[PDB]
Amino acid sequence: NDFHRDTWAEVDLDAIYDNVENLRRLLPDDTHIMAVVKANAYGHGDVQVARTALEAGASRLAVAFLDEALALREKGIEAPILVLGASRPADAALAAQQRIALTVFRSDWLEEASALYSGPFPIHFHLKMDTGMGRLGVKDEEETKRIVALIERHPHFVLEGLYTHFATADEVNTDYFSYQYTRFLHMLEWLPSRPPLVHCANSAASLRFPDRTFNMVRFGIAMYGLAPSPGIKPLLPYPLKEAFSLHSRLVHVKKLQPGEKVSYGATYTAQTEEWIGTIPIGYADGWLRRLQHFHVLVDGQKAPIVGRICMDQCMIRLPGPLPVGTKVTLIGRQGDEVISIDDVARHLETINYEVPCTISYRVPRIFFRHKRIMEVRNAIGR
Amino acid sequence: NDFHRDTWAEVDLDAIYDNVENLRRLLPDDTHIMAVVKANAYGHGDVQVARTALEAGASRLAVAFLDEALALREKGIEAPILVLGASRPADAALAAQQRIALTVFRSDWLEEASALYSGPFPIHFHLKMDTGMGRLGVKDEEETKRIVALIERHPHFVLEGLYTHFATADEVNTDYFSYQYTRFLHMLEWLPSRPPLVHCANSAASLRFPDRTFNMVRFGIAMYGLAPSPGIKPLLPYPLKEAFSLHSRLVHVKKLQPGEKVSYGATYTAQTEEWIGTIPIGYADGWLRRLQHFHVLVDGQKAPIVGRICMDQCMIRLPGPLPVGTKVTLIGRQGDEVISIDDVARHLETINYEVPCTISYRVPRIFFRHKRIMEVRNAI
Ligand SMILES: Cc1ncc(COP(=O)(O)O)c(CNC2CONC2=O)c1O
Numbered sequence: 177n178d179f180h181r182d183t184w185a186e187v188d189l190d191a192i193y194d195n196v197e198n199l200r201r202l203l204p205d206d207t208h209i210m211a212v213v214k215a216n217a218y219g220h221g222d223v224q225v226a227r228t229a230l231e232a233g234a235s236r237l238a239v240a241f242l243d244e245a246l247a248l249r250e251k252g253i254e255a256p257i258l259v260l261g262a263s264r265p266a267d268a269a270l271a272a273q274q275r276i277a278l279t280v281f282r283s284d285w286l287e288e289a290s291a292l293y294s295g296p297f298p299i300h301f302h303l304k305m306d307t308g309m310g311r312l313g314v315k316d317e318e319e320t321k322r323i324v325a326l327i328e329r330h331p332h333f334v335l336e337g338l339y340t341h342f343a344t345a346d347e348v349n350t351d352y353f354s355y356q357y358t359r360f361l362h363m364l365e366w367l368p369s370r371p372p373l374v375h376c377a378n379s380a381a382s383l384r385f386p387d388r389t390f391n392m393v394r395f396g397i398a399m400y401g402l403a404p405s406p407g408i409k410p411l412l413p414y415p416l417k418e419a420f421s422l423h424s425r426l427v428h429v430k431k432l433q434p435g436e437k438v439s440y441g442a443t444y445t446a447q448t449e450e451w452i453g454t455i456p457i458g459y460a461d462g463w464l465r466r467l468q469h470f471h472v473l474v475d476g477q478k479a480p481i482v483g484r485i486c487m488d489q490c491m492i493r494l495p496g497p498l499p500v501g502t503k504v505t506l507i508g509r510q511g512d513e514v515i516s517i518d519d520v521a522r523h524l525e526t527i528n529y530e531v532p533c534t535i536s537y538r539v540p541r542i543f544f545r546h547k548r549i550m551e552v553r554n555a556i557g558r
Numbered sequence: 559n560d561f562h563r564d565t566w567a568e569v570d571l572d573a574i575y576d577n578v579e580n581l582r583r584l585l586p587d588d589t590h591i592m593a594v595v596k597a598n599a600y601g602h603g604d605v606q607v608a609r610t611a612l613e614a615g616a617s618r619l620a621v622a623f624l625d626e627a628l629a630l631r632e633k634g635i636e637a638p639i640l641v642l643g644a645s646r647p648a649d650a651a652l653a654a655q656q657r658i659a660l661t662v663f664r665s666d667w668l669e670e671a672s673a674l675y676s677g678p679f680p681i682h683f684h685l686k687m688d689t690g691m692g693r694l695g696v697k698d699e700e701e702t703k704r705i706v707a708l709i710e711r712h713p714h715f716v717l718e719g720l721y722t723h724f725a726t727a728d729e730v731n732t733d734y735f736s737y738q739y740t741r742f743l744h745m746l747e748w749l750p751s752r753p754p755l756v757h758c759a760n761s762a763a764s765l766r767f768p769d770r771t772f773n774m775v776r777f778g779i780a781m782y783g784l785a786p787s788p789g790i791k792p793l794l795p796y797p798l799k800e801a802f803s804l805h806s807r808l809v810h811v812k813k814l815q816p817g818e819k820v821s822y823g824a825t826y827t828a829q830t831e832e833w834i835g836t837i838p839i840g841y842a843d844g845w846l847r848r849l850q851h852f853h854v855l856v857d858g859q860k861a862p863i864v865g866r867i868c869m870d871q872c873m874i875r876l877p878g879p880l881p882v883g884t885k886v887t888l889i890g891r892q893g894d895e896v897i898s899i900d901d902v903a904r905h906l907e908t909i910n911y912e913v914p915c916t917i918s919y920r921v922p923r924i925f926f927r928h929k930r931i932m933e934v935r936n937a938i
């Protein structure tokens with residue numbers, strides 16, 4: 177695959193292998209790892225991360241909605257995939273044919289699906305319980321038993337799993353975590369029998385309490401080498417390896433005289449004789465306008481973004497006359513200096529999860545494995 | 559195509575057709591309209607918009623970088639395309655072969671392209687001048703002459719046009735605008751002969767000063783029915799139709815008791831007996847976390863997003879117990895109420911340009927033309 181703009185993101189797949197393998201070491205052998213690659217693997221490349229995670233010890237994959245699961249199938253992934261979110265009852269036949277497990281949390285969904293499906297493939301369900309997140313999931317005993325009965329009555333419906341999700345597993349203070357875990361324990365007793373897969377842990381819960389994970393963990397953010405929250409960094413068992421880096425190159429260089437203005441709204445004004453560089457990356461690439469007072473790395477040094485950010489490019493003050501084509505690093509390391517996703521996140525005033533997800537389809541992803549380039553993936557490519 | 563999640567964007571091509579045809583009426587027969595269709599047509603869909611604009615009166619298209627132009631070509635667009643940004647001298651042969659015009663602003667670029675390309679297709683260049691924007695462009699007299707000379711000197715290099723871009727055309731205060739307009743008229747004299755296409759205007763300057771747009775207007779944001787700025791709104795010649803809307807459906811409804819918490823960090827606490835709905839859209843869809851206190855529309859009413867926004871989902875406080883499957887409009891009209899992209903931008907503390915751009919590849923686009931569903935575009 178190829179790309180024709182000097183702006184690209186690099187994804188280090190060795191880092192992803194390490195982050196997942198260290199977890200395989202940490203957890204009991206009887207506990208499986210479900211790698212969650214929703215949102216195109218948190219903006220890292222769905223099938224590439226999936227292939228790598230399965231190599232390091234993962235056995236299942238999790239995705240947010242049906243299309244994401246189907247896309248993984250079309251690219252040759254044969255491992256089990258669980259759709260964590262909602263789906264249409266009409267799509268039950270397609271899920272069953274493609275061996276995609278579904279999350280279920282209401283009986284009226286099942287009422288509706290028994291009526292539209294009748295074999296021959298089995299559909300594996302994972303009952304979702306709401307123990308305090310308030311998102312999706314059952315909350316009463318009458319509804320829990322209704323779902324289980326409806327599943328038991330259809331010969332092609334199978335209850336393969338049961339799970340919940342924590343809202344504060346990444347907080348140093350475990351008070352709410354405890355209420356939720358205890359509630360899950362109370363809620364599991366409402367089932368006539370334990371299905372084979374009971375899971376509740378996300379990255380934070382499984383890295384902090386490996387013995388409290390039952391038989392399957394849903395590993396996300398930590399797989400990419402990003403800490404679940406600033407709170408728990410020191411509580412992490414093994415060092416995490418950041419996998420995403422973002423780069424560009426100088427396409428224009430020029431010296432300004434005192435008084436000349438730069439960019440939209442002509443916000444910036446040079447005061448001495450300064451060198452301004454232009455890079456081909458803007459907000460349509462996920463490098464949002466709010467980052468106008470941030471900086472990038474040029475030739476081992478910090479250089480500020482100058483003026484407002486444009487849709488496809490932005491300007492930065494240079495230390496002096498640098499050659500056109502000089503590599504600029506937006507996220508990553510250049511010498512002794514480094515800009516991490518948490519740094520960008522802080523400036524954007526968000527969590528690290530939101531940063532790689534926002535780097536758009538427009539930006540090519542170059543995959544590295546064994547310290548060498550594996551493949552290039554340009555979404556708007558030929 | 560089709561999609562398997564109840565979250566989708568709707569693009570009204572009729573709106574885009576009207577926005578272009580009205581300008582086509584407002585401008586002189588001699589003047590071309592170059593529809594700016596970069597960034598997947600500002601998140602509206604590149605081919606679908608390019609095609610609609612050409613039908614409405616545009617004769618040319620403009621893209622940001624080479625990959626966006628090659629993408630239009632591969633989808634059947636055969637109209638002229640100008641790359642507004644930079645490209646590699648080594649890709650000039652590809653641009654030529656695919657009939658893509660390139661922006662040029664540095665003499666060393668040409669010197670390099672010349673050594674690499676010998677023929678046989680001609681390459682049409684547009685000389686970009688920097689008149690106070692500080693982005694791309696030539697600034698001195700002898701750099702201009704060197705570029706012109708390098709082009710004149712090569713058998714397959716053709717200078718088809720030259721242009722500049724205004725930094726403050728959307729500003730009521732036209733003082734920096736007049737400085738740039740004047741600088742341009744002056745720099746045009748460093749050229750021996752005025753090329754066939756001279757352009758300077760973006761949506762703002764073309765709708766504000768249509769006669770001072772030489773013979774080609776680059777039409778962007780206004781094509782999509784969005785004003786360049788809130789200040790320019792009551793100075794525009796015709797009403798713009800908004801083309802983009804975003805929708806979802808309730809996938810869960812439940813009643814919460816007081817003291818019960820919602821979402822990450824448990825930052826929302828139910829105070830009364832509330833009905834809470836879950837919709838399948840989150841920040842990976844471009845519905846950023848910062849929209850946490852914003853109102854969406856459900857059943858003709860404003861309903862707040864309650865608790866933190868997740869990667870693929872978020873919750874809202876419902877007026878009452880509504881059925882699962884109820885349509886929620888995030889951007890658009892629900893009977894009496896409307897949420898415009900300008901409203902979303904206000905809350906995100908940005909400009910409308912950024913909003914449809916941010917809604918991701920994950921969200922399907924459904925197209926309407928002649929008041930009927932024309933096409934569905936699902937990226938994954
Ligand atoms: C049901 C479920 N399990 C596991 C995960 C993995 O979480 P981590 O990447 O922190 O290990 C998620 C992510 N869902 C997200 C993430 O952000 N918002 C969400 O709804 C999830 O929804």
Ligand SMILES: Cc1ncc(COP(=O)(O)O)c(CNC2CONC2=O)c1O
Nearest residue numbers: 486487488594642760761776777778779
């Ligand atoms: C060279 C060029 N011409 C015309 C346009 C159209 O602008 P309008 O949408 O206001 O009519 C743009 C968009 N450039 C933008 C828009 O936002 N940031 C940019 O760099 C452009 O870069």
